[PDB]
Amino acid sequence: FEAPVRIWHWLTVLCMAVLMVTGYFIGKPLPSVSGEATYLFYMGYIRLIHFSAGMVFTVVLLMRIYWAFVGNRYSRSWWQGVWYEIRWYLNPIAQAAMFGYFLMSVFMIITGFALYSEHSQYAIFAPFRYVVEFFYWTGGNSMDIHSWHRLGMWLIGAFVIGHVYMALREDI
């Protein structure tokens, strides 16, 4: 068994809200506590909720993308790119927004997993270890992965401020 099609959107939103709130505090952690670190795991739980929200998010996102593809794009190699451009200068800047949004999510996954699979996951995560070499090729290290990952989160939050105001503008 499964459910209605809007479940697989409210999920992503739930995942998104969690990956943001948690990922935020992985980089700018909450105030410090004090006790006996045997019985305390606050930061560890934030990271855990993050990685596994990122698991769910990743699965849902990829199935949700697989269908839009199979179904022609949306509506029920740079040619199409250069042509998207001519008709693009005349709602055409709103599609490129929803597209950029799904492009970010995938970037947040490629980068997010490069970090997660690092300490020798040694299985199906083998490709993500090109992302690392790439950032090294850039003349950087895995710290840059963290930085670009944190940036992606802010960029997503930008669309969300737009996409939310744009939706609430459908309070006709």
Chain contacts with ligand HEM (rule: CB under 6 A): 16, 19-20, 23-24, 26-27, 47, 50-51, 54, 57-58, 108-109, 112-113, 115-116, 146, 149-150, 153, 156
The distance of closest approach from Cβ of residue 113 to other proteins in the complex, given in angstroms and rounded to an integer, is 10
32 near other proteins, judged by CB under 8 A: yes
**83: which residues sit within 8 A by CB, 6+ positions away?**
none
Q: Identify residues 129-158 at the interface with other proteins (CB under 8 A).
A: 129, 132-133, 136, 138-148, 150-151, 153-155, 157-158
The distance of closest approach from Cβ of residue 66 to ligand HEM in the complex, given in angstroms and rounded to an integer, is 17
The answer to whether the CB of 72 falls within 8 A of the CB of 78 is no
List the one residue from 13, 40, 94, 98 that touches other proteins (CB under 8 A). 40
List the one residue from 9, 13, 17, 41 that touches other proteins (CB under 8 A). 41
b or e along 117-152 (b: 16 or more beta carbons within 10 Å of the residue's beta carbon)? beeeeeeeeeebeebbeebeeeeeeeebbeebbeeb
Window contacting other proteins (CB under 8 A); options: 24-32, 73-81, 84-92, 104-112: 24-32
Q: Identify residues 58-117 at the interface with other proteins (CB under 8 A).
A: 58-59, 63, 116
**57: which residues sit within 8 A by CB, 6+ positions away?**
12, 15, 16, 19, 105, 109
- The DSSP output letter for 92 is -
The runs of H, that is alpha helices, within 28-91 are 42-70, 79-88
